[PDB]
A paper describes a structure:
Because the [name] genome does not codify an adenosine phosphorylase, one alternative to fulfilling this activity is 5´-deoxy-5´-[name] (E.C. 2.4.2.28) (MTAP). This enzyme catalyzes the reversible phosphorolysis of 5´-deoxy-5´-methylthioadenosine (MTA) to free adenine and 5´-deoxy-5´-methythioribose-1-phosphate (MTR1P). The observed overall fold of SmMTAP is similar to that of members from NP-1 family of low-molecular weight purine nucleoside phosphorylases (PNP), which consist of a central β-sheet distorted barrel surrounded by α-helices, as observed in other MTAPs from human and bacteria. Furthermore, a comparison of the KM levels reveals that [name] MTAP can use adenosine with the same efficiency as MTA, which is one fundamental difference between [name] and its host and reveals a potential target for schistosomiasis drug development.
A disulphide bond between residues C233 and C242 was observed in the [name] structures of [name], N87T and [name]/N87T mutants. SmMTAP structures displaying this SS bond also have the gate loop locked in open form. It remains to be characterized why there is a preference for the formation of such bonds in these mutants and the biological relevance (if any) of this SS bond. In general, residues 229–242, which comprise the catalytic residue D230 and the gate loop, are disordered in subunits without ligands. In [name] structures, E230 usually points away from the active site, and F231 occupies part of the base binding site (BBS); this movement involves the reorientation of both the main and side chains. The presence of the mutation [name] does not alter the phosphate loop compared to the SmMTAP WT structures. Intriguingly, the results show an increase of 158X in the PO4 KM for the [name] mutant.
Author numbering:
A (entry chain B): 2 to 235, 240 to 291
B (entry chain C): 3 to 233, 242 to 291
C (entry chain A): 4 to 291
The structure:
């Protein structure tokens, strides 16, 4: 019944100020060191832990982030949930810089990253885990993020029920799919055209394997993406984009803080049990 | 003189296809195979079995030593490899309980050792650019299909038969797999994309196994079992157990069919295709 | 200016110019594929590096692209011209043609594809480089004009009728899918790449083109269309002989184009283009 919310801060959250620090935790996991020390505290009455994905100084690129250590360390400190941010590029006309997206789907183009806790090697947990991922996020937690935005007077656009003419910017998109590329380079026009033609909404570099390991760890995970603009190469463009992005960070902070409180206002007993049981029923070695 | 190797996937972690005559606990220049190799006979035809995932199924797809498994079978004199693969369906006419004798694939694996050749000190020297347009041994595919006919299993050929002749459960006479790295299953977004590309099924173990078999100069063919990973479970599991029994029958008949023919020319062509693919020569 | 040349299949033993000397270098990312041939084309300094090393013993996935590009950068190169042998995916690109690529779709993995990271084997930092149009456009148009000056047909599908495609020709644009190799594609894979609208398939363009931009160098590639499906003909020995002889004629044409391209580069001023190549690197630093 104990609820505790971990937060993985991406670009723009390299040193977040979400709450007063009660504890600063330098932790080691069986999969190595996390990206930085973990800061533990309280939002209202809800215990919370925050970790910068890229470390202080933003020195670790997307492909070298130790996703296993970050997720394992949050589990180890008792987290039941993880809320994560990520900065992204738009692939579709209705997703414009300054919007947010509460993702529900992804296509994985990453490689070379440790993406599972289990295996046959000495540095892994014993066993073979095949997790279902058809809808890869925790749906309850997704809806918390969306309600938090409604609660903070931020426009919410749901393409599954609202006319396109009701898409008022800036807005939180209530659903969406990301293609996760490995980085560090951005896509060619050729690549972006194909990703767009496949119906993908945004592009990012950090969602996978973070979302996958959160599920393997029995935790409820949801991501909120900040749409920004990486195409100033076609002047003063960068300051306008960075001013919009600073505003985006303010609003996502309010969304995150309100989502933590909304998580604590509910019972999660059966959802946490289901999270843990799904890990156990996915063991193919038995 | 033929010798048939068998790589058993999920459902064949402990095959018992024949009375064990001998065991081979071996290693290779590319590391340890998945498990000890079990030697025997089907009729008069020599046969060797190894479970792809090891006994107890402790080895995930991306950590299987495909190089070592293929090399160990080659080292014992195998001329053929028959493999099983458990798969999910991407298309309406492939339903749980069916089988596919694959003839195509789309590779989305990474991080696996997938060639015996290169410039690293521990590789075989040379640059091997092997053709893979039709990646399986066609003679051996048709053996698997014929074996299913001889064991009273429906065969469906969508090139020549109307959809109304697709009577389940059936062996699909051709098909393409997307091979994903795993260990996780696909998102709905990924499945939708793979389906829209026209791929029939999804698997995690076919590649690089098929590629390395051709590098080794061996005739390779795969029979996939269609099951249902996203689902209830009691009916799926009992159905999968029935499919395992059917594949066992197909494999034992296939070994006998192989031994019944001469393979001298096909084997020599297997070996010459390796030679002619050496760009360093 | 100073032009580096990375020669692929068909350029293992380069004899482009009156060779001055051969040079062995080291880089912070290891040794390059081979020693380098230093010389001159007119007044312009030129260096040549066989991508696969002499003997062609290094396969595409094991090429040390970082060391090759950084070696050329450390020798003062401002430009890199690369050749790449490729297969066609579309009806109008036939063996013997050439392609001055302007786009790619990347299917490589497991190669060192960036100079920057948090590991000791890399430069300190996080570099996020724009790649929307991944080649140097001025250098692309140099290769094309060099083909015109050498009386090689040039075909621009945006502006020319396909029946007005005279072979052998230089296609003025084109997209590559770069597969990791070493095996060739299945029919299923080729069909999907074709359906995506890709023009040719190769194994060596990426990360070479990405690292050249990371290094602040102007990079353009001329692909050589050849034929990899001799296994389909009833007379494969004769097929490979004919394909090999046509490929030999192609490398003669490409040598002409490369030599003319080097002189065309040295004839222009590149002060602002080079400056822009450098500032793009700097501004792509997300840690700074």
């Amino acid at each position: 019944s104990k609820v505790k919310v971990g937060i993985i801060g991406g670009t723009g959250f390299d040193d977040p100020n979400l709450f007063k620090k009660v504890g600063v935790r330098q932790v080691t996991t069986p999969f190595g060191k996390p990206s930085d020390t973990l800061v533990e505290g309280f939002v209202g009455d809800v215990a919370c832990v925050v970790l910068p994905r890229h470390g202080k100084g933003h020195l670790i690129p997307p492909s070298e982030v130790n996703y296993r250590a970050n997720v394992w360390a949050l589990k180890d400190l008792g987290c039941t949930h993880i809320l994560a941010t990520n900065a992204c590029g738009s692939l579709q006309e209705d997703l414009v810089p300054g919007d947010f997206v509460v993702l529900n789907q992804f296509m994985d183009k990453t490689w070379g990253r440790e993406n599972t806790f289990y295996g046959s090697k000495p540095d892994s947990l014993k066993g073979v885990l095949h997790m279902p991922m058809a809808e890869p996020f925790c749906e309850r937690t997704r809806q918390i993020l969306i309600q938090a935005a409604r609660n903070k007077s931020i426009n919410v656009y749901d393409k599954k029920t609202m006319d396109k003419s009701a898409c008022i910017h800036p807005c939180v998109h209530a659903e969406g799919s990301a293609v996760t590329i490995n980085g560090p380079r951005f896509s060619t026009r050729c690549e972006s055209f194909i990703h767009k033609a496949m119906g993908l909404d945004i592009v990012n570099m950090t969602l996978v394997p973070e979302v996958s390991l959160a599920r393997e760890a029995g935790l409820s995970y949801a991501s909120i993406a900040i749409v920004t603009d990486f195409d100033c190469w076609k002047h003063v463009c960068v300051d306008m984009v960075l001013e919009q992005f600073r505003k985006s960070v303010v609003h996502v902070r309010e969304i995150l803080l309100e989502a933590v409180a909304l998580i604590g206002a509910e019972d999660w007993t059966k959802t946490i049990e289901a999270n843990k049981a799904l890990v156990m029923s996915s063991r193919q070695d038995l």
